[PDB]
Design a protein around this ligand. Structure first.
Ligand SMILES: [Fe+2]
Ligand SMILES: [Fe+2]
Lengths: 669, 668
C-alpha cells in the first residue's frame, strides 16, 4: 500500500489537479454570503440597547463584481428577505408556523387593513427587518456593483448574433424547457412566434376580439398609407383580434402629448452623481387576425397610441398571412422587428404588474385578509380555501418592500424617475392601482372570461382554437375544479337559502367589496354563486398563477425576445421607422457595455428567478385526512382521477397545436 | 372534440384512476396545518392573544395509516424547526437578515442555560410540544401492507425489498436489508469501521482480555482461549459504562415502561422495552476482516455476574454445523449489541459529540469574539442555522422519540428529565467528551490504530479511518494557511485580545475543560480544524447513512421488546421465535409504534451543504479587495485537494475486501 501519510503528502506537495476557475459558482454557501454582507456593511445598524437606527451600515455600495456573482447575490438576498418575511409573519401571527387556535375576535385585531398611504392597494397592514414598517431597497443597489467585468456576459454583444451565440452556449444538455429559453429557436423574432405568445406565453388571457370602432380606425389609417389589401382584410373583418395597451395613459394620468420616460439616477450611497440613464415605454396596440387553421397572425402595430391613430405611428405587416412571402425575410425586416419588440415591452408591463402581481397575488390577499377577519376557522369555506393560501401573505410583503420599487419600477420605462422618494407619484404604482381598481372578479371566472373576450372555445369544432391551449386546458380544468367545489359546497349548502341565512357569507362578501376594495366580488346569495367564487379562488391560487408565472424564465431570460423597456426614445414619425436598421433595433435593447445597459439585462433576466426559483398532492392529502366528511372524501378521490384524466388532455392540446409551435406543458399536474 | 365534450366525458364516465393505488408521498402543507387545527393539535390562547400553556385537544388521534403517520411526524417536526428558526430570528440568536451588533450587546443576547432543563450547557432560550407527537400517532392504525406486520422475519424482509425505488445516492434510497445476509458476522462487525458509529471501537486491554480468557476456560472453550491468549489485534467495543453513566447499580435491570395516556392520564395499558450494557470483543485479521469472537449481553460488573456467549466461528472463513442464519442465540446476542450501539451512536456520537459540544462553542464564540475578527469569519459559516435545530431536538426529539424507543427508562413519558436515564446518559457523554483526544490523529492513535504508517493492508476495511486521516490533514493545511496569514508567531496568539477568554469561556461556562488553552499557533490551527471537522465531515460520517442502517429495524433496533434471558443456558436454547419476540414485529404490544419511530428518526435527523461550495464561495468573495490574497489561494488549494481526495475516498471504498458495502459517505 501507499500509506495515508503518503497520499496526504502527495496531494499537499504536488501541484493542484483541479483549477477552481474552471468550476463556476452555482449557489452561494449561505454562511459565507451572510458574512460578506456584514463585512461590506450591507446590514442593518443598531444602537447599544439592540434597537434599530433606520439606516444601513455601509455608506456606499459595492465597487467591483461579475455578472454571475451579482446575479446569484440578488437571488440570495431576496430569498433571505422572504425568510425574514416568513419569520416576521410568524411572530405577528399573520401566518403562524406552529398552528394556533384563535377566536374570530382576536383575529380581527391581528388581521388589519393597510390604508393606501404606502402607495399600494389594500392589503394586510404589516406592523429585525420589517419592524421599521426603503432601507432594504437600498441594500439591492448596494449588491449591484458600480461596474462589472463585461467579458463573457450575456449582454456584451455587440450584435444580436453575438448574444444569440452566447445564449445557446449556456443551455444544459417539459422538464427540459425550464432550463432553456426562446432563443433556442433561431426564428425567435418571427411573427408566428411573436403572436403565439398572446395565446400560450406568460400573458395568454388579455387578448380579445377587436371592436368595430378600432377596426374602423385602422381601416382609415390603412387608407392613408395607400395599403389596399390590408384595408380589404380589415373591412371584410373576419376574426380580427386586438391586444390593447393604450390604457397605459388613462391609468397613469398621462395626457396624450406626454412621453413615457424613466430617468435613472446613479446614487453614491444616497446622493446622485449627475450620471443618468433614460428608459422609455409605450402604450402600444396590436391588431392581429386569426386564421382558419389556427394561426394567429399580426397585421398592425401602433407603437404608442396617443389618443388617435392620426396622432400616433402605425406600421402594417408586409406579410398579410402566416404563409405570405415578401422579398425581405422576417429576419431583416427591421422596422417591423422594432415594432414587435416595442409591443413586447408593453406586454412585459401588463403581464408583470396586472396579470401576475395584481390579478393573482394582490386580489388574493384582499380575500385572504377578509376571510380571516370574517369566517371562523372551523367553518367549511375556511377549511377549503385556506390550504391554497399557505405562505402567501409573507411573500407578497417581500414583493412590496423590494421587488416593485427595486426591480419592476427600475427596469420599466414609465418613470418618471428612479429611484423615487414617494411611490404614489410613481407611474408603475399608479398602473398597479388602476389594474386593481379595474379587475373584475366575476368577468375573470374562466367561462365568462373567454366568452367576454370573445372566444367560443366551449362549442367550436372548426379547430380555429387549436393554438390556444391556455384557453382549451383552462375550460376543462375550470370545470373539474368547479365540480369538486360543487360536491363539497353542496354537502352543507343544499339550497339557495342555506346560503342566504349563513351567518358568515354575507359580511365576507361585504368585507371584500369595501375594505378589500373589490366591488366586483359577488354578493353571494346562491349556491351557484358560492361554487363559482370558491372555484375562482382555487383557480387564482394554483393554475392561473402557474399558467402566468411558470414559464416566466423561458420567455424573459433572453432579453431581446421580450425586454422590459426601450433603451432609446421611439422614432419621431413613420418615415423614420421605415428607415430603421439592425443598429436602430439594437440600440433600443439592453446590449453592449454602455449606458448602464448591463444592469438592465441583469435585472430583467433575474426577475423570473426572483418570482420563481400542486393540485394532486392537494387531492391526495385531502383524501387522507378525510378517511359530511364521507362526501369530502369521494369528492377528493374523484378530483384526483379527473386531474389525471385532464393531464392527458393538456398534453393533447399541446401536441394538437399547428406544426412547429412551442409546447404548452405549464398545467401538468 | 370540444372542451365541453372532454369535460363531460371525464365527469360522467367512471374514474380512470383509483387514488388508493397512488400512496401519499408528501403532505400539502396547507391541508396538514388545517387537520392539526381541526384535531386540536394546536396551541390554545386566551381572548387577549396570550398562550394558556396547554394544547386544545384533550385526547390524541384514533385512526390512521403507517404512511400518513410516518409523514405526519416528519412534517410536524419540520414545522417545529421553522418555528425554531423564526423564533431565533426574533430574539437575534441567529438573525436571518444580517445586523451589526457590538460585542457587548451580544453578551446580553447569547446566554448560558443553567442545567435546570436537564441538558448540558447550551444557549438559553427565551412539554406541550412533546404532547403533540403522541397526539399525531393514532392509538391504532391499519396494519395491512406495513413494514412491521410480519409475522416473520422472512415476511418483513420481503416487504422491505419491495419498497426500494425502482430500477452512492442509490444507497440513500435503500437499506442493509438489500443484503440477504444482513445478519452475518461480517456485516455486523463491519459496521464498527464503516457504519454510522465508526469511531468508538478500540484496542482491548490486557485486563479485559484476561476476563474473557477466564470466562472462556469456564465454558470449556480451548481454541477461543488460545486465540485470546496469543492476543494478536484483539479489539473491543465497550458499552458497559451505561451503568456508571445512569447511576445504575450492578443488580438493576434497564427497562422503560411505556404508559398509554388518554390525553394526559394513563389507561393502565403499558409496554416495556429493555436495554443492555453489552460488550463485543472482536479480532482483526491480516487480510483486513474484523471478526467477532464474544458478546457479553449486559455486563453487570464482572463476567462472573453476566452472560457471555462466544462465537462458534473463530474466523471470517470458519465453518460450523449451524449456518449463521440459524444460529439464533448468536443472532440474538448480535441484535442485543446493536441496541447498545444505537444508543451510544444516537446520544453520544451524533447528538453529544457533534451537535451539543459545537453549540457550547458557538455560544462562546459569539459572546467573546467580535464579528469582524478572523476566527469569527472562518468559524461562523460552519454553524449556519445550527442553534435553532439543536432546540427542536431538545424540546421534542429527545423526550418524544429517543427517550421513547430506548430501553433505559425508567418510564415514558417522564415528568422529570433529570432522573430520566436517556438524559443522564447524555450528561455523562458530554462530561466525558475530550475535545483534544478526538482530533483525528489523536483519536486514531488513542483508540490504537497505526493508520498513519501501516503498509500491511490490515486497515483496508476501515475506510472511515483512512479517509479521515487524509481529510483531516487537508482541512488543517487550509486552516494553517489562513490562520498563519495573521498569526505569524506564537506571541501573536498570546497577545490576541480574544483567544484567551474564548478558551476560558468554553472550559468553564461551556463545560468543555478538555478544550485547549490556546497559546500557540499550532494549538489555534488544531482547534479550528476540529470545529470544521465537527461541523461538516464528522457530522456527515455519523449521520448521512443513518437511514441506510436503521430503517430496516431488525438489523439495528433501538431496543429489545422482551427481557434478556435469565442465564446462558436459556440463551443457548434460543430459537427464531425468541429472537422475533424481542424485535418490534407484529401487530401487538404497540410494536408498530416503535418500528414507526425507529424508521423515522433518520428522516428527522437527516435534513448547499458541503465543503466544495464552501471553498468555492470563499474563493469568490476573496477575489475583490489576514490577507485576502492569502485567503484566496488557500481556498483554491483547498478545493483542489478535496477533489483530489474524493478519488482517494473512492479508492479506499473499492479497496475493501470483496463484498464489503461501499463507503461513499465523504464524497465532496
Ligand atoms: Fe407569483
Ligand atoms: Fe445531526
Amino acid at each position: 500500500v501507499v500509506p495515508p501519510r503518503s497520499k496526504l503528502d502527495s496531494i499537499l506537495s504536488s501541484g493542484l489537479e483541479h483549477n477552481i476557475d474552471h468550476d463556476p459558482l452555482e449557489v452561494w454557501d449561505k454562511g459565507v454570503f451572510l458574512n460578506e454582507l456584514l463585512k461590506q456593511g450591507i446590514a442593518l445598524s443598531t444602537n447599544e440597547n439592540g434597537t434599530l437606527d433606520g439606516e444601513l451600515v455601509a455608506d456606499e455600495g459595492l465597487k467591483k463584481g461579475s455578472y454571475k456573482g451579482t446575479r446569484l447575490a440578488l437571488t440570495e438576498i431576496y430569498s433571505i428577505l422572504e425568510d425574514a418575511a416568513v419569520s416576521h409573519f410568524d411572530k405577528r401571527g399573520y401566518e403562524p408556523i406552529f398552528p394556533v387556535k384563535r377566536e374570530l375576535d382576536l383575529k380581527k385585531r391581528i388581521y388589519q387593513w393597510s390604508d393606501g398611504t404606502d402607495g399600494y392597494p389594500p392589503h394586510l397592514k404589516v406592523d429585525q427587518i420589517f419592524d421599521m414598517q426603503s432601507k432594504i431597497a437600498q441594500a439591492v443597489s448596494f449588491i449591484i456593483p458600480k461596474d462589472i467585468d463585461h467579458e463573457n456576459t450575456p449582454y456584451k454583444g455587440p450584435t444580436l448574433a453575438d448574444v444569440e451565440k452566447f445564449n445557446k452556449a449556456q443551455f444544459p444538455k417539459a422538464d427540459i424547457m425550464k432550463g432553456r429559453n426562446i432563443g433556442e429557436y433561431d426564428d425567435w423574432y418571427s411573427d408566428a412566434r411573436f403572436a403565439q405568445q398572446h395565446f400560450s406565453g406568460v400573458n395568454p388571457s388579455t387578448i380579445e376580439t377587436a371592436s368595430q370602432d378600432k377596426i374602423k380606425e385602422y381601416i382609415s389609417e390603412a387608407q392613408k398609407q395607400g395599403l389596399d389589401k390590408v384595408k380589404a382584410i380589415l373591412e371584410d373583418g373576419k376574426d380580427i383580434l386586438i391586444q390593447d395597451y393604450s390604457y397605459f395613459r388613462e391609468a397613469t394620468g398621462a395626457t396624450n402629448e406626454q412621453i413615457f420616460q424613466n430617468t435613472v439616477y446613479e446614487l453614491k450611497g444616497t446622493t446622485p452623481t449627475g450620471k443618468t440613464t433614460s428608459r422609455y415605454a409605450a402604450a402600444s396596440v396590436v391588431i392581429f387576425q386569426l386564421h382558419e387553421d389556427g394561426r394567429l397572425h399580426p397585421l398592425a402595430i401602433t407603437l404608442d397610441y396617443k389618443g388617435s391613430l392620426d396622432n400616433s405611428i402605425t406600421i402594417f405587416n408586409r406579410r398579410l398571412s402566416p404563409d405570405d412571402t415578401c422579398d425581405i425575410a422576417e429576419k431583416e425586416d427591421w422596422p417591423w422587428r422594432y415594432a414587435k419588440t416595442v409591443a413586447q415591452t408593453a406586454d412585459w408591463a401588463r403581464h408583470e404588474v396586472a396579470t401576475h402581481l395584481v390579478d393573482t397575488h394582490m386580489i388574493e390577499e384582499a380575500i385572504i385578509v377578509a376571510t380571516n377577519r370574517i369566517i371562523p376557522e372551523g367553518e367549511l369555506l375556511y377549511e377549503i380555501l385556506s390550504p391554497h393560501w399557505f405562505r402567501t401573505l409573507s411573500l407578497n410583503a417581500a414583493a412590496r418592500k423590494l421587488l416593485v420599487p427595486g426591480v419592476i419600477a427600475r427596469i420599466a420605462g414609465f418613470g418618471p424617475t428612479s429611484p423615487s422618494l414617494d411611490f404614489k407619484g410613481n407611474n408603475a404604482f399608479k398602473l398597479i392601482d388602476w389594474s386593481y381598481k379595474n379587475f373584475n372578479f366575476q368577468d375573470k371566472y374562466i367561462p365568462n372570461d373567454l366568452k367576454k373576450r370573445g372566444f367560443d372555445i366551449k362549442g367550436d369544432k372548426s379547430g380555429k382554437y387549436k393554438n390556444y391551449p391556455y384557453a382549451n386546458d383552462m375550460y376543462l380544468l375550470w370545470g373539474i375544479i368547479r365540480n369538486f367545489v360543487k360536491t363539497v359546497i353542496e354537502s352543507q349548502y343544499t339550497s339557495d337559502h342555506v346560503v342566504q341565512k349563513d351567518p358568515y357569507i354575507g359580511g365576507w362578501c361585504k368585507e371584500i367589496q369595501t375594505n378589500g376594495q373589490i366591488p366586483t366580488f359577488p354578493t353571494i346569495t346562491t349556491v351557484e354563486q358560492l361554487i363559482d367564487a370558491v372555484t375562482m379562488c382555487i383557480h387564482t391560487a394554483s393554475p392561473q398563477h402557474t399558467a402566468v408565472n411558470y414559464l416566466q424564465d423561458y420567455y424573459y431570460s433572453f432579453v431581446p425576445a421580450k425586454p422590459p423597456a426601450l433603451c432609446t426614445p421611439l422614432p419621431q414619425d413613420l418615415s423614420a421607422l421605415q428607415g430603421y436598421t439592425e443598429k436602430d433595433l439594437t440600440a433600443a435593447l439592453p446590449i453592449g457595455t454602455e449606458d448602464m445597459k448591463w444592469k438592465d439585462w441583469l435585472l430583467a433576466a433575474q426577475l423570473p428567478e426572483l418570482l420563481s426559483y400542486n393540485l394532486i398532492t392537494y387531492a391526495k392529502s385531502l383524501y387522507n385526512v378525510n378517511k359530511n366528511c364521507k362526501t369530502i372524501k369521494k369528492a377528493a378521490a374523484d378530483f384526483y382521477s379527473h386531474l389525471k384524466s385532464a393531464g392527458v388532455e393538456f398534453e393533447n392540446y399541446s401536441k394538437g397545436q399547428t406544426a412547429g409551435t412551442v409546447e404548452y406543458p405549464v398545467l401538468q399536474p
